[PDB]
Amino acid sequence: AMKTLEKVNYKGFIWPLAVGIVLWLITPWRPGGLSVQAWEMFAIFVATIVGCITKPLPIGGTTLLGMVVTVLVGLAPVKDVVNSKGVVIQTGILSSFGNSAAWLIAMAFIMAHGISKTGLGNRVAYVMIEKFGKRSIGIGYAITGLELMMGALIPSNSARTGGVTWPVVESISKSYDSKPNDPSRKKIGAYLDFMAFHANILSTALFITGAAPNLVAQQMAAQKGYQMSWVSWFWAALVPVLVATVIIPLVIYKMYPPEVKETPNAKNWADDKLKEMGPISKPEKIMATVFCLAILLWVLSGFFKIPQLDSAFVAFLAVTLLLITGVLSMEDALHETGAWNILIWLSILIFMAGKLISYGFIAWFAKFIQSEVHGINWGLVLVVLILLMFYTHYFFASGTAHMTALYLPFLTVATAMGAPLGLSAMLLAFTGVINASTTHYANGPASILATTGYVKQSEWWKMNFILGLIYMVIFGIVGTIWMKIIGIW
Amino acid sequence: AMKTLEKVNYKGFIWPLAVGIVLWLITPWRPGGLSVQAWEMFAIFVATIVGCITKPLPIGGTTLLGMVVTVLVGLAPVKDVVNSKGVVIQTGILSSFGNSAAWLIAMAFIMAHGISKTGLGNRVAYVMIEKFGKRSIGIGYAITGLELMMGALIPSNSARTGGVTWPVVESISKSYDSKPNDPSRKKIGAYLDFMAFHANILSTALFITGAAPNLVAQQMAAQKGYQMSWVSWFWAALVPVLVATVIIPLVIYKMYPPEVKETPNAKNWADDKLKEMGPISKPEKIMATVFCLAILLWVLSGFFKIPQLDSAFVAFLAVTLLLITGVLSMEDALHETGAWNILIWLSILIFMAGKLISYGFIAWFAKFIQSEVHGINWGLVLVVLILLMFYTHYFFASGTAHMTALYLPFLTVATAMGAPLGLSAMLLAFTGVINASTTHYANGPASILATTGYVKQSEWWKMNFILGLIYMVIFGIVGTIWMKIIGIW
């Protein structure tokens, strides 16, 4: 019954494969000490990322093409190759899909559809349109304050983004007639999408329990003899985080203003639509009960490290509660396509970047940086190390892997050339937080919010580059002078 | 705006939950030598399967609830617990989803949607409705011939079902107005679904390359000192397979007839609808070409063991070709809910059965049966071993794992009690083939065809039980005397 082919953007293929081909041919001229497979994997990964920007096919199609090409040129098995002694000496593409980040985000997508089905989403949206809808930046500051308060309680940033702030932004933009993948997207949806992302960055920076890279940094710094202690982290971050809480939202507002900037009659419009919506119903009350069990289990996860409190498992059990309760048919959860899309593409990207790690590319880079800096005072060693830890996150889809790979090497560099370990440790952990202001695979929240269709990826990458400059300036300078005002060095 | 709740079948919970609770509560009197964790995992598994038949929720919902319950009672982590030397000492629930069987079947589901989207399916359906179909048992024997022909070439049984025979059955039954999850299913669809399953069983029985358990059996028999020789297997199976090729289709036709048994004008109807479909189009030409590249890559799978020829990867590569050409939009591939349903539920069931293995349940069973059979002549030893090898496949979601677990133990039993090594090696390998006539998770094809909505699972299990009796009689006795005519025992 199909007559013509789907319109495919073939020009989108010109840039990635050309880039890949060119870097393929530069394999004889690799830096030395590397590996031919390491350089080939770098080539395929960069080609795939450029494909995620030039968009031949949606990102799922581009990452599927990348994964298929990866297997085709012999850089990754399909099944895990097992040691002899049980170890997996090289992992295949099918294990890509047993990833915690992807599964947490996908199940969070399913519960967000639950929220919007009940009608709870629009109830929360109208409550917040009444209390801050007068002036859009009021709503923006509302959700940044909400994220900042959640930072100290919900120890995983992806749970905060996919469970709370993204449902809020979606609801609010639906009540404003702002739908994704549409010109309509720019009435308020895109500004609040980007603001949610950077609020998540700020909340991760404020608390040592904002994201797992923070705790990796804490363990690695403790290995070298420096104890971060929540209050230590909090007091070191308080003033730079506040300077950022004022600078970043306003630079976003000037750079990415939200079309509709004032709703002078927001209070009465919101009250009317809450009155017509009627009192809360039993599907919405059930949904709220499951939502607060998800929040409470995520918070207890912070104190009890057990499987039953795993952030992905909390989402799984929340959705199975949603199924047994009757809020959600399983045909409702099945054709909620964002979950399976993110499962495909984010798992493939995490796998390819992990291969970048496992072939010795990041290790070679750490060794290169260890050998290249020698005749310099420790202040400039610190500036250069902050810059390198920042910009190497273009080659990471995790954050925990980034810290595991480069935090202890860079920290040993800094202390080996005279810099004080507490200051350097704090600076590098902060850079590990502000790394998120880069790619769409930087962390979980970046993967959610760069893909919802409200913010194009041109704008995402460019504005994140600008904000990364501002974040580094803020944290570097303000945090260094604040951290000796408090006595850390 | 949701008004009232989705209807949930709560009575469906009584039987599984009752069974689970009682099997939990009799844990102290477990058979002895069995871990409490093995017995508890057994209880959860039986509860989940009983739920898949009593249906408190769709199969995805019940297996998800089962997996959540598994984690809740401390029988499975969420992340893999790794040794401190790379070994995995306990496997978590997220690794379940990097499964080749589930992913192969899911990508085949999306490629079948491609076939039926282009209109290629209905062209194939009308060609065979014109060449067979005036009498529906003609269609049944046609698809049985198709499976029999593919058995010697395409080494994966699920690839044969999901890549070829299921699209054929769906196409034909859509052209016969026999449509799933409704009474209309009984015009011809259910008959062709069940007949496809058993054609796949027979073709797997005919050739030593019919499914992976065959090659596991041959390697184990060589470990014990008996060499199967393709022609060996073919010659030993041919006459029993022919007796089955005559008996089983007729027993299915009498037991499960297809309401529409005669189409007196089938050839002219098919010629009419082929005339009006018009000449083949470029979308269908592209789809047919990628289909036959999939088939040739699957046949090369039989001779070259390389990742680029992996049957799951071949499915991935076929779908990415379908994406590059434009046959399939990526939103088309995203809202095909059968693929994600099969991924979820089949991955969870394979995971739970694996836990059945890894906790030592099947090992205790092998040792118990080793202790139980002692004072009996070897003919009765062979009968009871065939019976046990058949009926233990209710506690297996793989088949390869079943063979790896119990084939060499049962064979050492049989040979240790006087039986001739070639005879029971062949009898147990045949039993491993005809094991499929059991559950809906028996093998890949069983999970595909038992779930399409054409065959209820009540009738599936019951009719599979009857046909399993018939399969055992045929293969056991007829194959034993036929294998005595040849120089085997």
Residue numbers in the entry:
A (entry chain A), B (entry chain B): 0 to 488
What does the paper say about this structure?
The mammalian SLC13 proteins are members of the larger divalent-anion sodium symporter (DASS) family. Structural information, along with cross-linking and computer modeling, indicates that DASS proteins operate in an elevator-type transport mechanism (Reyes et al., 2009; Drew and Boudker, 2016; Garaeva and Slotboom, 2020).
We also solved a 2.85 Å X-ray structure of LaINDY in the presence of both malate and αKG, using the LaINDY-αKG cryo-EM structure as the search model for molecular replacement. The structures of LaINDY determined in malate, αKG and in the malate/αKG mixture are in an outward-facing, substrate-bound (Co-S) state. Notably, within the binding site, density corresponding to substrate is seen in the X-ray omit map of LaINDY-malate-αKG, and in the LaINDY-αKG cryo-EM difference map, in a similar mode to substrate binding in VcINDY. All three Co-S structures are not only similar to each other but, importantly, also to the LaINDY Co apo structure, with pairwise r.m.s.d.s of 0.41–0.52 Å, indicating that substrate binding introduces little conformational change. At the Na1 site of VcINDY, an arginine (Arg159) is found in LaINDY, stabilized by a salt bridge with Glu146. Similarly, a histidine (His392) in LaINDY is located at the equivalent of the VcINDY Na2 site, with another histidine (His401) located 4 Å on its extracellular side. Based on these well enclosed and sterically occupied cation binding sites, it is unlikely that sodium ions bind to LaINDY as Na1 and Na2 do in VcINDY. Rather, we hypothesize these two positively-charged residues in exchangers act as permanent surrogates of the Na+ ions in cotransporters.
